[model samples]
Target: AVKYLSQEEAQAVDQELFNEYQFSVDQLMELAGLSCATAIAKAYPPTSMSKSPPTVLVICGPGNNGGDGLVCARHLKLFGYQPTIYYPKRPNKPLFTGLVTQCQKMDIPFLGEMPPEPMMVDELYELVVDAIFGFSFKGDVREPFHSILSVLSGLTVPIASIDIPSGWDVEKGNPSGIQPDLLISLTAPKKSATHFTGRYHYLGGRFVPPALEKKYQLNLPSYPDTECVYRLQ
Candidate 1:
């Protein structure tokens, strides 16, 4: 059986990769975002411009996950896809601010709030990228995120989540959380993914070395051909 990691375990793997393997967190975030873009491209081809090209609204939280979302938007823009960011809680750190500047250089719009109505959002975007939270999250969801999640739950479009779905428990799935049609699990899939019946599930984060893999007992799937990502169940 595939080994499922708890939030702490996953964080430990990340630390091990950095502490022992010398993989910088920035490098990992870049790889994660690039892999996410690759998965999105493979799953949904860009539509004809005459038919109105597809747009993705990426929702970013205040943590490292938000950094990933910012990077994903930049890649999506380079790939010829329209991707906007809804970052309600932008971080003050230089690394994160740099990411925001990079995306803005490409003219990616940052939405200040969720659209007034679900239909408006539906009409505006073809998909949503949920980067609001990851496995590290705990306790009752708070503040604007609580309200933001509420708004996202009512949308009709497909959602593609990075790492674990936002608002879901690391060990157990969130029954009330919005379901994502696509998931790109970084490094390995967390235990919560067992409950996901999504059409597309991908494993990314290709930086894990063989020693760490064995130590972590991660039975990861092989990426097809020379691809950076592999579609899993």
Candidate 2:
């Protein structure tokens, strides 16, 4: 069976990747985001969609996962998809600010707030990218995110979640959480992913060193050729 990481194990591997392997967060995140974009393209190619330049709504939160979403939006644009970002709570870090600037330079529009109605989203976007929360998330969904997730849960459009599905427990999956149609699991599959009955399940983040993989017993599937992501289901 594929090894699914617990919250503590995932945290440990992440730390070791930085400290022992000397991999920078920026480098890892770049690879991760690109892998996510690649998987999405494969799963829902622009050519296969109803419209040319199929519209995507990427909803980002206030952490590294959101940073990945920012990058994914940019690459999706390059791949001929029209991506609009909805980042309500942006961090004040340079990395995030730089990513936002890059997206703006590419003329990608950012919504001031998420549309209150699911119908509005369904009318506008063909897909939604959920980069709201990661492995570290705990307790109740808070603030704007609670409202945002609520809206997302009601949408007719398919959602592609980054890492752990937003509002899910790292180990204990949330039945009432937004059920994504696609899940791009970063590094290795988290324990909660076993509960994902999503149409597409992919393992991304290609920066893991062989040593770290062995150490963590992350029996990840091999990426075909030079690809950075692997389909898990």
Candidate 3:
């Protein structure tokens, strides 16, 4: 059986990665984001799309998850997909600003606002990437995100969520949250992932050290060849 991490365990592993292992946030985020992009490309190749250049909408939040989204968009663009970003809540941190600059430099369009209508999104894009929340998120959905998630939940186009699905409790899970067609769990599968009934489920974040993995008893599946992600289902 695959191991699933509880909220507290997830936090501990993250802290250890930064403190004990000396892994920087940017390093892990880069690997995590690349893994997400890699899994997405494998699952939905640009050639498989009806259009010549497959269009993607990536909705990002204010946290690290959103940063991962920014990076994912950049890689997706390189992978021959036209990715537009919807990032309503941006942080004032330099790392975040730098990520935004990188995306802009790549000529990836950042939407002024998320389309309020589900039909509008369905008509505009082929896939939606949700990097709106992570394991740290808690409490009820708030402000702009609430409305954004509402629209996403109603869309006909498939959504691919990074880490925990937006609006879901890291441990308990949320039945009413948006159901992603694909999920790329970072670091390790969180407890809520067990509730996922998505078409594709992948494990990303290949930066975990062996000692840490053994310490946490993270029974992660082996990745095939040089791939950064492992297909879980």
Candidate 4:
């Protein structure tokens, strides 16, 4: 069975990986983002993603998760898929700007503001990737994200959430958050994943060292064939 981790446990494991194994966040984010791209390629083919080529709208947030979306968009572009980023709360720090620069270098466009309407935005993209929130998010919804999450709620297009849905509680799911058609859980499955009823649930991010795995007592699933992601449910 897949082990579900609480926010504290997950955070501990993440820090431990870095401190003990000297694994860099940059390296982990790349693999996580790449796994998301691999899953997107599987969920929607080139023909179905778009008439000519697949168009993916990636909704990113203010932190490392947003960094993952930026990376995912870059990989999607390299894979011949059209990806646009909607990041209303991008930080001005170099950590984020570096990733954003890389994406811009590849020509992946970032919308300056929300679209006029969520319904209209739905029709413009073939798929949506939500990378707005992760295990560290807490408390009530804040600015920009409040509006962004509201717009996501109104979208009819399929959404594939990265890590966890944007507004959900780390341990208790937000019953009102947007329901995703696909969820790509990173490292280990978060507690909120129990609320996921999606058809495609994948486990990504394969940088767990054996010591940490044993420490956390994680019973992870094996990746099938040579894939970076494994379908969980």
Candidate 5:
């Protein structure tokens, strides 16, 4: 009854969805985000979200995948909670200094750099929104990452992943040994999100794989095509 996800597997899946299902990745991301947000709102009811926005600790990176985390932060803020964004710096990309650019505009403080070592249980987070590494995750997670995940693993606070948990490998699966409370796939199920325990769920709000045109039934949209971007439900 639940969906799954694989990291950095968008290219292959996007192709397959088009060749087989005929859909665009754009639609996939949109639909997936909406779906994921739905679940998040349900989990954190309006009263709780309004009364006191949980200290949202989003571990963000730079990329479209990381962009998902940014988009989510914007959405959550509207609901009355401006989640803390922990965007790390990366090169070869128009980095936001860890999404600080957006956060500043919204008056949200950006937590730069993750701790170098893990903390004790219950010292982790009010809520850890893992956006450090999205679908493009590759190679073994090392320093900074290890320290961060170590701390996160011990926390009693609820964890919500933007796409897949930071260390989790969609294709490789469980390479990072992470188990989040909830796993939401941005657009479609990557097969890895649903591979583990009872602590996760899927959100296919973006375009469904096969890149099918959500409007035109059974007809797939062209690859690399993006849905018209605008801020409104």
Candidate 6:
């Protein structure tokens, strides 16, 4: 399964990737998002483990991770599922590329507009796809982002993240990732959000699938391990 990293460690990993593979942050992000979501959709049925093509709230950010989500959202539509994108605007090239491409190509609707206007969480249901912050995340979840996590943690909808659950701490998993409906690690899991107690699953090579799904079952964990990866138990 995938996990999180401390801010410092997240940076370290990024640096390592840059120094070794010469991959830019945007590349890493696209790699993560596209990898995870593809696997997740393939693993389960349109009913989402046999229910219905649950409405997917793709919570995106102004980063490369958001770019990946846009890709997934577009693909999900073709797969016969409804995908709504909630992406914040920003000024990044590659990141914007994927976001705009998917939104336009698939005709997916955008959520949380008008920049300053805040969003309400309690009313929305179905599912949540957390492609907010990538592995480059630093510090605790705060402001709109923090509030977003808080709302989802208590909401009735299930969540599925791209790389790691937002707000998860890498070392010791102290801060902890907001418990999501599901956590889908892309490319591979990292240490940044490993401390999260949420249900987790992973991508195997080029494919994605739904591995962890505690949200549907509402499984309260009796045991926690960064690597064990939670599911509906």
lDDT of 2 by residue, 1-69 (tens): 569999999999989989988888788888888988988999999989997889999999999999999
Top candidate (lDDT) = 3
How far residue 107's Cα lies from its native spot in candidate 6, in Å, is 0.9
Better structure of 1 and 2 per lDDT: 2
Q: Report the C-alpha lDDT of model 5 over 1-233, residue by residue, as the tens digit.
A: 22233343455555666577765544444454455555566556557642355556667655556566666676666666646666665445444344446656887666666654444223434566776676666746766667777777766677877666777776656754667777765544565655556355644354443324332232322322343211111
Q: Against the unseen true structure, what C-alpha lDDT does each candidate score?
A: 0.85, 0.91, 0.92, 0.87, 0.57, 0.57
Query: Against the true structure, what is every candidate's RMSD?
Result: 1.6, 0.8, 0.8, 1.2, 6.9, 8.6
lDDT by residue for model 3 over 101-184, one digit each (tens)?
A: 999999999999889899999989999999999989875678899999999989998999999898999988888888999999
If scored against the real structure, what TM-score would every candidate get? Answer: 0.95, 0.98, 0.98, 0.96, 0.69, 0.68
Q: What would the TM-score be for candidate 5 when compared with the true structure? A: 0.69
lDDT of 1 by residue, 139-178 (tens): 5688788877787888888889998888888889889888
lDDT of 6 by residue, 1-233 (tens): 23333456445545656775576656554555555555556545475543355556787776666777777787677777677777665556755765676577677888754122223443343567887776666655656677666666666656777766766653444444466655665433565444446554554222221222221221223223322222322
Judge candidate 6 at residue 193 and give its lDDT.
40
TM-score of 4: 0.96
Worst 10 residues of 2 by lDDT: 134-143
Worst 10 residues of 4 by lDDT: 45-54
The 10-residue segment with the lowest total lDDT in model 5:
224-233
lDDT of 4 by residue, 173-210 (tens): 97878899999999999999999987899899987777
Q: What would you estimate as the lDDT of candidate 4?
A: 0.87
